[PDB]
Design a protein. Structure first.
Lengths: 605, 603
């Protein structure tokens, strides 16, 4: 019978009766394709880590109530078995809120169908949904608990609840009760909060062990004293020792020096503390999974994070320096390290425009639109991610430019506006709430509205999306709306129906093919796609949504392309949805193209 | 129907009635694992070549009489269909003698069962063997001719016969006839010789189109004049334009500057000549396949050649330079070129002694030895490659150092000498024909003799191997021999039966694992032997060739990834012949290393 426990007398963990502490690394299985899970986990082991830490994003597994995804890239059970087979332990963080620069901090958007829900509280509607999620997830985690033969040694309840305004201790008690019900009475349950009494006040709970987080700019002594104030006995734990930091579109790429991380890691380890490296590998926010901060600023597609392992899993100087730190305390595994993957510049691939969004509406919205007097939000129209088209008619002639506006700043988050197929420009949450339009009376006014990511931290995580308040034209509220939820993902997988079902330009889908020879042992290889001359959009290869590009803002210019979605002999189909301006009018088809390169550019001006 | 022909009227090839010239690179399918055949061939095509040229080594396919190998790495037909699939035409060179820095110039050693055989002549026993070989090979090549829907556009008869002393024209005429009977009247048949009347004299033949070869050192106008003397009309052809040159153990690694190859290549092509780059990729002489020159000098395991593609298929600066010459004459295919393969340094892998050769004779020689009054050759003992142990007893006492000698220099090619299991040192063909030994009377005298590779060029290609003449001790002829042919390949595959200043020749073995479920492992690597001296190496039973870090220039041996596994451990076996770094109290010195770069040009 296997045991894992906190030893209070000796300020230590006990593993099968023996003293234990962990040196862990954060890896998010939802940000690494499964094809590479073993690769990253093995490099994590060879670095000298004896555990890994991950988050379970609720919204990654229950995109509608009672419809679950636990297979393929969503197979959290297999991921945890893979960690166990490699001799790694696991610190599980199942939320139900994870923060994590992930859409809505992991909470499902369909929770907002109750408009007034208070998230992360004893709101009975929030609790009932949490409870049903825990009834599905936790029984799957139970045989993976250390004491039942699996790798899970500790489990985090909530995530820095001390940072949220609500301070609902009933909430935290309900989670504890439920985690206990499903997992048993022996599993070590813990919390993590900023290393300061003001955060620990509302984050800490009797019965759950109190850990802190802090990075290389914090005084180590103060931070651990802050923890000691809440737990006078038991191990010192930094649950998120920051190896890097998050980005936002339009801001420079965050970095943290190798020497600062190495030195702080040395100091933490020397105190005998358990430590988790956040992030050890960051990876990618594929599709629409990124989050945002308030005041509204979205995080980009890359989650490279400047982590010791790069986005594509490369071994960096930082990796080796940290491995060397760990070597001073433990005997790191022997033998060569699995390498940085080979990267391949497939070169330039021409695209051509297939159809505008407005022309593809039949395929994007095959059940037809929802008619409404005033606009409806993403949530009301039963779409959570991507894009929704809002359509009306001009109730006046606008031969002279008239102001189209959202007086309460409720374009959440960007609208690409057209009037009888003539693009008018953009409305933008917080930046531009008015845009002048022209056209005749009775012209069709289209706003293509993009969810850029639900805020994942702060008070404003109840971030519905779409047109969340009225639009006016010349000060008068525009009524009579036709609203098309866009099934972009299906439509792209069907090549807009073409394959069956077995200054600005109009938002449109541009497609192009490239081939890769068979019988070559080293092809395909990973690559990086770049969009010189494009502006802002979404990109897919063979229907796999790689995420968002926005070279107009940076810092990210390339997107990471893992080799397993690429195919040999059979043509690889690139689909680009360009929202703002495509380099594709002129009589040079060579300009209407993307380029694959062999080094990332995530760190641009 | 398709047509390929020489139009003499027009000084050109005509393919389907249209003017044609080829720009070809040599690739020997026998020197590249089949796992990488498509890689090398598609790199060749992206370089701008419209054809490849290969040699068919007889002995690679007919190791004993009427026992054939045409499968897997030996599948020539497949290799040609592959070239064809990729849109490449083929210049086939089926010998029967191919030269090629390859064991006896491709000729099987079993021809030497007739001691007096005159190789490459109308010796009727040579011709009868050749003829049975042609009757198995050429009916296979027939459907692969251009005219029957395959890739083969021209076929070479013999190889540089003008360089051989025999000058037997009836041999050449027999070859033409038998090539015609099996291939038909339309195939373009041709010969290749050095570009000088003295080489063409005995190489050229009526009804076989005369081509020449030459490298970057030659006057290109004079070279083609020497050909035009022989063929006043038809295409100019340099069948072997040297991109590089061969190596010998113990000599500096050969190189030819990129600018010289590019320069000549442009000049040849500009004349409207057809040309074949020898080698475009060289590859590897795995196992015992390397040849030798006279006076006896063996070529190494690596056949990199300083070719445009390195031993391991890598794209080199030479490669891009020649691609760029070709581009000025022909649009070259679009798209990215397949990359140089990633290389992985597996690092250090410790070995430990398994068995001496002396102590492994039951598994190496399970038939029992051969008693003979005087020494027999490798051929008489029915073994072709590798090693044979010769054993006798000392007749006199050698308390004091007695001379052991092969006075006619008859150790072919190297002997690892032991008396009662005490290594005495080494006898070398052409270099050390005497070694002073000691031991008691009745002591066991052992000589482990190595076939270092049969000479592939010159008069002395009838290279029997073994103790080819007598050995004397204190000038007395040593008699009464117990001779053990050694099944090294089976023994190694079976871990020497254990299934489920000098040292004694001995096998050393160790293991290393590679993780499964890593998309980019295993990778190609280079194995290196710091501290070792001379020997043979197998990984998972596959004989990667010979090592000789004592002599150079080659220090690393190429290991291709497809023979490496992840489902169970990989085994390295070394047969060290001279000195093993495994006596020290430090097991960590008894070890090889895998690195991620080649060292084939050490001084
Ligand atoms: C950190 O804080 C302690 C007191 O808790 C202080 O005494 C120490 O000097 C500080 N260290 C640094 C590096 O500022
Ligand atoms: C819209 O047009 C009016 C002129 O009618 C101008 O005063 C105002 O600056 C414009 N607003 C925007 C957002 O361009
Ligand atoms: C739109 O306009 C009217 C105010 O006249 C209000 O009743 C309604 O709630 C507003 N709708 C939205 C979505 O803001
Ligand atoms: C791209 O590929 C698919 C088949 O894989 C096909 O349906 C589409 O029409 C192609 N276009 C081109 C130019 O190959
Ligand atoms: C080659 O020889 C010819 C005479 O045959 C002479 O005209 C020419 O200069 C030589 N070319 C070179 C490059 O030496
Ligand atoms: C014995 O061997 C030595 C060592 O090389 C050799 O030089 C010498 O000629 C031999 N001595 C006699 C007396 O024959
Ligand atoms: C060795 O010696 C004797 C001559 O004294 C002779 O019968 C025989 O030809 C020789 N054998 C070889 C292999 O040299
Ligand atoms: C496999 O190789 C390892 C080297 O780590 C060695 O210790 C072990 O004895 C080998 N096992 C077998 C079955 O040869
Ligand atoms: O990368 C920044 C991190 O900040 C922490 O406060 C949070 O707990 C993490 O989930 C993540 O948001
Ligand atoms: O690399 C030197 C070459 O010499 C050629 O003349 C011969 O035909 C080839 O087989 C090869 O040996
Ligand atoms: Cl985590
Ligand atoms: Cl050839």
């Amino acid at each position: 019978q296997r045991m894992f426990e906190i030893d209070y007398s000796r300020d230590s963990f006990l593993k099968d009766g023996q003293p234990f502490r962990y040196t862990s690394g954060s890896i998010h299985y939802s940000r690494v394709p499964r094809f590479y899970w073993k690769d990253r986990l093995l490099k994590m082991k060879m670095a000298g880590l004896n555990a890994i830490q991950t988050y379970v994003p609720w919204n990654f597994h229950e995109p509608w109530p009672g419809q679950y995804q636990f297979s393929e890239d969503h197979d959290v059970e297999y991921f945890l078995r893979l960690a166990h087979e490699l001799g790694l332990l696991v610190i599980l963080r199942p939320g139900p809120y994870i923060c994590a620069e992930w859409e809505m901090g992991g909470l499902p958007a369909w929770l907002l169908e109750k408009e007034s829900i208070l998230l992360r509280s004893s709101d009975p509607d929030y609790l009932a949904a949490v409870d049903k999620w825990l009834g599905v997830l936790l029984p799957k985690m139970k045989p993976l608990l250390y004491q039942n033969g699996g790798p899970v040694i500790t489990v985090q309840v909530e995530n820095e609840y001390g940072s949220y305004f609500a301070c609902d201790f009933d909430y935290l008690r309900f989670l504890q009760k439920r985690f206990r019900h499903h997992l048993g009475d022996d599993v070590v349950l813990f919390t993590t909060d900023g290393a300061h009494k003001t955060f620990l006040k509302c984050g800490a709970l009797q019965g759950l062990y109190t850990t802190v987080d802090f990075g290389t700019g914090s005084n180590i002594t103060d931070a651990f004293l802050s923890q000691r104030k809440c737990e006078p006995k038991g191990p010192l734990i930094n649950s998120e020792f920051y190896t890097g930091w998050l980005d936002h579109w339009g801001q420079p790429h965050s970095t943290i020096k190798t020497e600062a991380v190495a030195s702080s890691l040395y100091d933490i380890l020397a105190r005998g503390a358990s430590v988790n490296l956040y992030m050890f590998i960051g990876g990618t926010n594929f599709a629409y999974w990124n989050g945002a901060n308030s005041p509204y600023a979205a995080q980009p597609t890359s989650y490279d994070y400047d982590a010791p392992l790069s986005e594509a899993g490369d071994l960096t100087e930082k990796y080796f320096a940290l491995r060397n730190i760990i070597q001073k305390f433990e005997k790191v595994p022997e033998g060569p390290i699995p390498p940085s993957t080979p990267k391949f510049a497939y070169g330039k691939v021409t695209l051509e425009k297939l159809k505008t969004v407005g022309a593809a509406l039949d395929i994007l919205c095959p059940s037809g639109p929802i008619k409404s007097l005033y606009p409806l939000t993403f949530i009301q129209v039963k779409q959570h991610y991507g894009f929704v088209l809002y359509r009306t008619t001009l109730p006046q002639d606008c031969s002279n430019p008239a102001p189209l506006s959202s007086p309460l700043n409720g374009v959440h988050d960007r609208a690409y506006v057209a009037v009888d197929g003539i693009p008018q420009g953009v409305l933008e949450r917080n930046n531009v709430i008015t845009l002048n339009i022209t056209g005749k009376a009775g012209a069709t006014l289209d706003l293509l509205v993009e969810n850029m990511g639900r805020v994942n931290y702060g008070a404003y995580i109840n971030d519905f999306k779409g047109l969340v308040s009225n639009l006016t034209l010349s000060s008068n509220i525009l009524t009579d709306w036709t609203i098309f939820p866009l099934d972009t993902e299906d439509a792209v997988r069907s090549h807009l129906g073409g394959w069956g079902h077995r200054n600005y330009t109009l938002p449109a889908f541009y497609m192009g093919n490239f081939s890769i020879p068979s019988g070559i042992p080293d092809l395909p290889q990973d690559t990086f796609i770049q969009f010189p001359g494009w502006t802002k959009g979404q990109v897919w290869i063979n229907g796999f949504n790689l995420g968002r590009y926005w070279p107009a803002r940076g810092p990210q210019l390339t997107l990471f392309v893992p080799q397993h979605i690429l195919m040999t002999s059979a043509p690889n189909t690139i689909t680009v949805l360009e929202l703002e301006w495509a380099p594709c009018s002129s009589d040079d088809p060579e300009l209407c193209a993307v380029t694959f390169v062999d080094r990332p550019v995530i760190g641009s001006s």
